[PDB]
Design a protein around this ligand. Structure first.
Ligand SMILES: CC1=C(/C=C/C(C)=C/C=C/C(C)=C/C=C/C=C(C)/C=C/C=C(C)/C=C/C2=C(C)C(=O)CCC2(C)C)C(C)(C)CCC1
Ligand SMILES: CC1=C(/C=C/C(C)=C/C=C/C(C)=C/C=C/C=C(C)/C=C/C=C(C)/C=C/C2=C(C)C(=O)CCC2(C)C)C(C)(C)CCC1
Ligand SMILES: NC(=[NH2+])NCCC[C@H](N)C(=O)O
Ligand SMILES: NC(=[NH2+])NCCC[C@H](N)C(=O)O
Lengths: 307, 307
């Protein structure tokens, strides 16, 4: 008698990094000039660690034209467009940005940021002073573990713009890895991990029930194979899933609940940031994925919390 | 009675970094596996310093599809394509690469390199041993000043492939800088520098005589406004020219010869690499550029060599 909403609560003693959504909500109270300056300052203290590995799959060409338009504007116009994005204003550029996939939005700011650092576009005021609320939000971010810091920054950037085609390459079979998970050998869980690591989403989606759902960290469940597969193709390429250990528990009505913990790397940072993750699966009696939740964990001890 | 070939020899006591072409020629003797491994090792010791600032103007989309094709190949095929490029073999991919602008060729390898570092494509053997000739070439490169090192690497990469559309954005007028040059106020030289720094090549080209020529470092003169302007648009965007000082000397027949020294930054590295440069101008009696040579200098003392 499970529903997606009932499945959401499996393994309730998993401690997620709710400071991430808390800090994002605080950032969302700031004025646009404070938001831009805060991220610029965080960027100046970790921007060298962002890699180009996600750009190649994103298909940036149309967004890069808009990027180049900003390179042609005056100082006043460049500042206006950047505030329009942060304010989520209804402008043509803000609508275009709001329509892009997360990786395209990130690739846009990544390049604008290097251009600012070089003066190819104008940077942010050299003696700029954050408001009191903004300075406190910056302090909070700087105090977070690396994987929580980059999740704050990512969600702050992806949420900009106005609420209004990737190159997906499955890895050659001979170059694919096989995960090991201490305590877990169920092929549905192992091949969830392996097909994710190989970008083989057409095989991956067949592990799901037709009504199956996937819940990304701090987001609502994505329901149905069509929506889940779209999410895979748009946002989930070139991840490195490094599960470590897991536990299996019977559920009502022949269902099985599985918790796996481990680390995940995003191509935006490669091995420079290891994000502590949990995967919570509810498998049907036919051993298909009815529900999987992916959680960013509050601290590294949560990797060892299988009770 | 000046010709381009006679103009080439002005200011002959300018000491250029001929170790750069010497080292490139040595690299050109190596087998492809040695060439790939040598650059990979140099890359592992300076790849974090390459920035994304040149990608946005390059218009990479077609090349990125070919890049992604390599991401889909097996280990054997990825190694074969990389050797085909280094060997300058006649293959369809090598012909495509050979047709691309320098910045597109560099953006291709830049992304392939990050993908290798992350294992998104297969890297280079972990216990690979350079041949004796290759190990000696690597030592030579590692011993060069930073600006000479990146010129070696650039020309080694750009020369790969088979000898078989950028987004050009002039900077808004209010955001343009004006160079200062100790000892030089001739507007033809100052506005050569300023229009280069503003990517304003349509204004820049009008400073040249119709038969005027530009000689890039270690290359043959590019002759005629059409060819020079094409070179500007394809290869010369987002440079930072920081001239320091110069000297003017009369030439025969009302011509004027001018030597300027200073530093140049490429968007590939921003302020991380300052390249020591000389500009050697031969100006017509009408104060137009008949010939300009751009030289990479052998050492920093050449910045002070105006005799
Ligand atoms: C704005 C701005 C600027 C630029 C800021 C820049 C440049 C920010 C760049 C930030 C970036 C690039 C952050 C990247 C973060 C990426 C993360 C945190 C990825 C996390 C993915 C995870 C954890 C995936 C988990 C999953 C698993 C494991 C599954 O099993 C199922 C699917 C999937 C759920 C998705 C400038 C400076 C100019 C100043 C002005 C304002
Ligand atoms: C291959 C390869 C790999 C990747 C290697 C990579 C990634 C190399 C990247 C190298 C780069 C990116 C080098 C960039 C160098 C750029 C330079 C040196 C720019 C110099 C420009 C100048 C000096 C301009 C001077 C001019 C002036 C001032 C003028 O007034 C007139 C016009 C202009 C003349 C042009 C992998 C690792 C995967 C391993 C396999 C083999
Ligand atoms: N047989 C059972 N129903 N066991 C329940 C396991 C509860 C688990 N230790 C938790 O804290 O969430
Ligand atoms: N009046 C002259 N012609 N002077 C020639 C200057 C030569 C210059 N000092 C050089 O070494 O190249």
């Amino acid at each position: 008698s499970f529903t997606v909403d009932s499945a959401r609560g499996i393994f309730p003693n998993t401690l997620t990094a709710d400071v991430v959504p808390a800090t994002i909500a605080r950032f969302n109270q700031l004025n646009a000039e404070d938001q831009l300056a805060l991220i610029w300052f965080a960027y100046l203290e970790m921007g060298k660690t962002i890699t180009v590995a996600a750009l190649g799959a994103a298909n940036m060409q149309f967004a890069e034209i808009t990027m180049n338009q900003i390179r042609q504007m005056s100082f006043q116009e460049q500042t206006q467009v950047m505030c329009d994005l942060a304010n989520r204003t209804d402008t043509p550029i803000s609508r275009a940005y709001g329509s892009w996939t997360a990786n395209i939005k990130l690739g846009f700011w990544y390049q604008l940021g290097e251009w600012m650092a070089q003066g190819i576009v104008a940077p942010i005021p050299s003696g700029y002073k954050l408001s009191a609320n903004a300075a406190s939000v910056l302090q909070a971010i700087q105090g977070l573990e690396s994987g929580q810091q980059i999740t704050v920054l990512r969600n702050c950037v992806v949420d900009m713009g106005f609420d209004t085609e990737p190159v997906v390459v499955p890895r050659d079979m001979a170059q694919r890895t096989q995960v090991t998970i201490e305590g877990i050998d169920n092929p549905t869980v192992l091949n969830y991990m392996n097909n994710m690591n190989a970008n083989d989403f057409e095989v991956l989606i067949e592990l799901f029930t037709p009504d199956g759902a996937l819940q990304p960290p701090f987001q609502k469940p994505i329901v149905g194979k069509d929506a889940v597969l779209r999410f895979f193709r748009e946002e989930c390429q070139n991840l490195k899933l490094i599960p470590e250990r897991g536990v299996t528990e019977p559920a009502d009505g022949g269902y099985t609940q599985i918790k796996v913990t481990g680390k995940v790397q995003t191509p935006w940072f490669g091995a420079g940031v290891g994000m502590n993750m949990a995967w919570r699966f509810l498998l049907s009696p036919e051993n298909k994925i009815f529900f999987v939740a992916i959680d960013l964990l509050a601290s590294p001890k949560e990797l060892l919390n299988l009770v």
